[PDB]
Amino acid sequence: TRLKIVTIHQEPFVYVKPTMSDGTCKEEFTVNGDPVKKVICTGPNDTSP
Numbered sequence: 001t002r003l004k005i006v007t008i009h010q011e012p013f014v015y016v017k018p019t020m021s022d023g024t025c026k027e028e029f030t031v032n033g034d035p036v037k038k039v040i041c042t043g044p045n046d047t048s049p
C-alpha cells in the first residue's frame with residue numbers, strides 16, 4: 001500500500017522548495033491555468049557539516 005520513494009535534488013525534474021509556514025505549499029499555476037500537483041517531501045537542508 002505505502003511505497004517509500006527516494007529522489008535526488010535535480011531542479012528541472014524534481015523542484016525542491018522551502019515551505020510557506022509549516023509543511024505547506026503555495027498552490028502555483030502554470031501558463032495554462034493548471035495547479036501543479038505538489039507533494040510534501042522530507043529532506044535535509046544541507047550536508048552533515
Ligand SMILES: *[C@@H]1O[C@H](CO)[C@@H](O)[C@H](O)[C@H]1NC(C)=O
Pocket residue numbers: 045046
Ligand atoms: C537552510 O539553509 C539555508 C542556508 O543557510 C538557510 O537560509 C535556511 O534558513 C535553512 N533552513 C532552516 C529554516 O533552518
